[PDB]
């Protein structure tokens, strides 16, 4: 089944995790009044490289999905495994986690690939 772009918006997060390769595909898409689209598609590629930079400096690089060594803080809406992927949409989840997105981002770019890669540099010399 292929619901299309933004297809599984009202479905659970577990169900919407199957449509990751659909919203990612149509995210980049390949005299005045003609500069209207130029400045827009320039901000479009700046927004794309912005997200790609965040996805790269973290422990992912490989897009779509990646795991991390970060303990899930109970204060970030303490929910259960079966209460998130089978009872909540991505919009409803982002509405709750909007307070802690920047904190987690800081715990992802700094605490991980800056201490993990240096650890590998210490593990790869021997």
């Amino acid at each position, epitope marked *: 089944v292929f619901l299309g772009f933004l297809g599984a918006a009202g479905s659970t997060m*577990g169900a919407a995790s199957m449509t990751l390769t659909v919203q990612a595909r149509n995210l980049l898409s390949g005299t005045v009044w003609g500069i209207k689209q130029l400045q827009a598609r320039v901000l479009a590629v700046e927004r794309y490289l912005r997200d790609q930079q965040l996805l790269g400096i973290w422990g992912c690089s490989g897009k779509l999905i990646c795991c991390t060594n970060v303990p899930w803080n109970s204060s970030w809406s303490n929910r259960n495994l079966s*209460e998130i992927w*089978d009872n909540m*949409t991505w919009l409803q989840w982002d509405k709750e986690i909007s307070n802690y997105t920047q904190i987690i981002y800081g715990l992802l770019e700094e605490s991980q690939n800056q201490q993990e890669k240096n650890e590998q540099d210490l593990l790869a010399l021997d």
Partner: nanobody
Amino acid sequence: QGQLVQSGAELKKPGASVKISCKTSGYRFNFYHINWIRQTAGRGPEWMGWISPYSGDKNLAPAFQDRVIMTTDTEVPVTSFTSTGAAYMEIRNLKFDDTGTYFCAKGLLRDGSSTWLPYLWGQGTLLTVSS
């Protein structure tokens, strides 16, 4: 994390029918099933059946397969993630052993092996079948 309010207690003579409502509020009415479970003083707790407000698919118990009709109204959006709805049920051919408390229950999850499982319940509506 919502609220289910049922209709008032009614008195019905054997042979007639009765329609018990169950208005919900505080969540998306179409994202969870609506189970109907009764309880009498002679047969104990008995599950009557459930109905999914999205499609209209119903699943009644074989004991209530030929005398119970479950209906649901359309969802009335309140916010982007919460709403108010109403589910009804009409039990015909009332008998003396149908006197008891009738509850309406909200489903547990949207997907999985326990989607229809009764999680949030009502206050119950007492139904008395007497002459």
